[PDB]
Design a protein around this nucleic acid. Sequence first.
RNA 1: GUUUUCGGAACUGAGGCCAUGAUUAAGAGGGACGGCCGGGGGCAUUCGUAUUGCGCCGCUAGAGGUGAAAUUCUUGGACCGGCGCAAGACGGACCAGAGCGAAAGCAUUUGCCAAGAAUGUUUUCAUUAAUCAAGAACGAAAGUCGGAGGUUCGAAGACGAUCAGAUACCGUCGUAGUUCCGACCAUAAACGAUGCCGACCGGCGAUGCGGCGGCGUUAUUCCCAUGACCCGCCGGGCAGCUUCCGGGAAACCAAAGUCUUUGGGUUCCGGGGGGAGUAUGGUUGCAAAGCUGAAACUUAAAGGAAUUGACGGAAGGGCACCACC
RNA 2: UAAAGUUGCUGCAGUUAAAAAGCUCGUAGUUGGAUCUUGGGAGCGGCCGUCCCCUGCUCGGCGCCGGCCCGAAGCGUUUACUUUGAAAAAA
Lengths: 83, 91, 98, 129, 149
Amino acid sequence: PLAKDLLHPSPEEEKRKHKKKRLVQSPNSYFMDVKCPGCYKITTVFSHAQTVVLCVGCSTVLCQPTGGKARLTEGCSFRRKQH
Amino acid sequence: AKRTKKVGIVGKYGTRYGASLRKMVKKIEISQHAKYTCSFCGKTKMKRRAVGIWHCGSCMKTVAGGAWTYNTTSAVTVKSAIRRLKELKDQ
Amino acid sequence: SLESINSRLQLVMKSGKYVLGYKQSLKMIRQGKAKLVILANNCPALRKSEIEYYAMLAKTGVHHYSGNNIELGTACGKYYRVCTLSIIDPGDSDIIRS
Amino acid sequence: VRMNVLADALKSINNAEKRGKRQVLIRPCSKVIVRFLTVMMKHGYIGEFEIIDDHRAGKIVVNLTGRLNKCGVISPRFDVQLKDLEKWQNNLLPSRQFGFIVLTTSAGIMDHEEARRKHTGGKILGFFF
Amino acid sequence: GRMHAPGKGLSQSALPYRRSVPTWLKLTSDDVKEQIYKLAKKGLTPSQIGVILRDSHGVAQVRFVTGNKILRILKSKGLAPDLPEDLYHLIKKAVAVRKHLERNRKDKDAKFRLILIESRIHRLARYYKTKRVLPPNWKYESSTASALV
RNA sequence: GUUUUCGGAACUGAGGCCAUGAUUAAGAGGGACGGCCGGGGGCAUUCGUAUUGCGCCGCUAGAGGUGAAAUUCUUGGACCGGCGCAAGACGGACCAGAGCGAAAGCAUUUGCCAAGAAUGUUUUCAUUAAUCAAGAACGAAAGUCGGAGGUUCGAAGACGAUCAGAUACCGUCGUAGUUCCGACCAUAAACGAUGCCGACCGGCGAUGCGGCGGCGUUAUUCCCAUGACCCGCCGGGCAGCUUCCGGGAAACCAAAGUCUUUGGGUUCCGGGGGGAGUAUGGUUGCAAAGCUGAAACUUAAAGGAAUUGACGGAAGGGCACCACC
RNA sequence: UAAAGUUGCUGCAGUUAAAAAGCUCGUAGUUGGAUCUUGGGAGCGGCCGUCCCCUGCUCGGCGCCGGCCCGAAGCGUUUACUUUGAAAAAA
């Protein structure tokens, strides 16, 4: 269209764009507070974590790196940091 | 300085023996006098004593090698053949 | 684990205490100071068999390095040939743990 | 790579107007881009525009009217006297009536008439009509 | 696009607009700096620390929490290595490729790569001498490089 | 006459003092790290039938090759059928308007070696970049040099056909070459006859690689994460179709566009057709030849794209006893 | 010499008419992102339009009694750019 308002885009458009090609660039990543029943301290882990992440006192290995977002070991719960 | 343009060690033969034999013989006359790194001690001291005999100036170690070069291509390949055959026969 | 021991050496050359060479290393075995003795693969068979016997006496570890005295030299960041090397303080390297 | 920011900015709004768009984004902002557009705006060639200050080179959304035929940069920036200024507007402007040559000078960035009334030439940026 | 490739990939990072420290990280300047000094004595590059901190500890940026950047923090306490780590890595690669060539003579792709790698070392060494990091004495020799890997 | 006082010149010891000093983190670039991916490169290994050659067994009159023959092999057993054995090339179908690589180019299995793009990233340095005379690396095929190898094919050569002649096309033999190793040479219609980096400007359905999200089907059954499908999204890539975007001499081109409304940065390079990539100098190579390279003289056109007609030992559809059957 | 936009800085061409090096690296050469006092006031022109500012410590007065400041001069990141003046034989 001709009269596409570029200043106030729809929120169904800014989600549907590359992280650099928005109006203001934003990361598609987040920090997430991860629990596992072996451990007790919930730890601030990155989404695209890129390396194997460990507890205190060898409870288990939390996450594992892949091509994109990290994969969490079977039964490790996470909640996204909202600030 | 740069004493000769293209003739190297073969300048000692002067205007004798034909261009193409003197071009040919420079390739052998470099390597037969070259000092090689001794495999045993590491020192760059292996020298040709006689035909296919090689002596370390430091290690006091004699190796039977190629006539001009320390390792012949035909003797590298055969040691890789005898190793592989020893592996893939005795299993 | 060939790639990693060249990085552990880099970390003990910078921060650690040690002695290169043969006679200097054999002194530090008898002093009880040497934790680990690293040998080049082209080390004379009797010098390898003497180091090993001094090490099983002193109750220390022997690493058989995957490279000759020249490669051990360039591994230690030096411009000469190292056949025998013995670490006293690992410094801040995980070389004695592996 | 990007070695002239006016060039890209002016030819990014030029294509957008030929295409018949009502507003246009132009990615790298400058002092001189905003001081060029303000000169374009006060002669009634574009509407008002907004700056998107992210913490880099911010973006600019210009609200285009269909009045501007062509804005064009002159690269490199030829330093012009007042006597050189006359011949520069015989080969860049289509009339002695409408269209301006934006030129930077010690007073500020302005059209060829305001440079004539302030007796101070400088370097040419571009033109527009 | 790339310097020594026809690739034109648009894959870098995209930092947020909010430069403030979030209200979940309770760490302060004297906490994470000490932690950086623990990871730097372990023989890590500023990159390796910068990853480890955002992985296990949730440090979004070390520059945004503390005053200054990571290599600056190491240089401010006499922990920074001598020649820059982006120059150390290219020397390390040129050493690895030149070692591949002396064992395998006919590899003419590997030879072409060694020309591009060593050309990129010369461009970085040329830059760093103008900013006065390396001495003007400094120069890359392909014979003497395995020592200063 | 002197400490002067104190005007100027340098040296030396402290604590306070400023809001005490380092812009940002580019839809620039380099570097790290993550899981991937690919006929990308090198070394080694491994396999497959086929072709030719040999030995043995079978039964036998021709077999081969052509438009038709002939040269040639054969009752001394040829061709064909069956068991083997040997050596050297090659990598079928799968194989695609698919992939990778700077280009030349690259395809049997497994292993080893070093590399690279894209992707993802709230990692790192902070302008380190773009294009580049001189200079350097790689550069199909043919060809040159030294060593090993040679079965297929096959310049030169020999003969048989054809023919008005046929030192050609067709056929039977064949030497260098074709294969491997180590040096050489440096050109191709080396093509997309289209410089590179960057910006903007219509759709549509696919495709490859990475990431993301979502009904369900399917295997691992013992459910999740994953493998194979399904529906979209984002990025980079080989391409399609489609538009009065716009351009172009047109053919055509989402670039060959944004151009008399002429300016983003930059390298090479053309100036009517010949003589001519010739002569002569210089340089490179063992050679063959490469790179740089004129002039005298000659000439009114040579040429690009499209139109109509004629023409064809061009195709499709008809027709005529001034054509045939 | 113009016409020659058939030598092009203004101002040409390089898919097929003449033309992009076979490919990439690379030194001079050329070219290089954004970023740093902006608004608002203040008197007088007629809601708006000019002047002046976010600078300092040898020498005269409208002077008061070791001094309360304005008048002339030695001074204050460098260059390109523009503006004016000097100086520039006539013909």
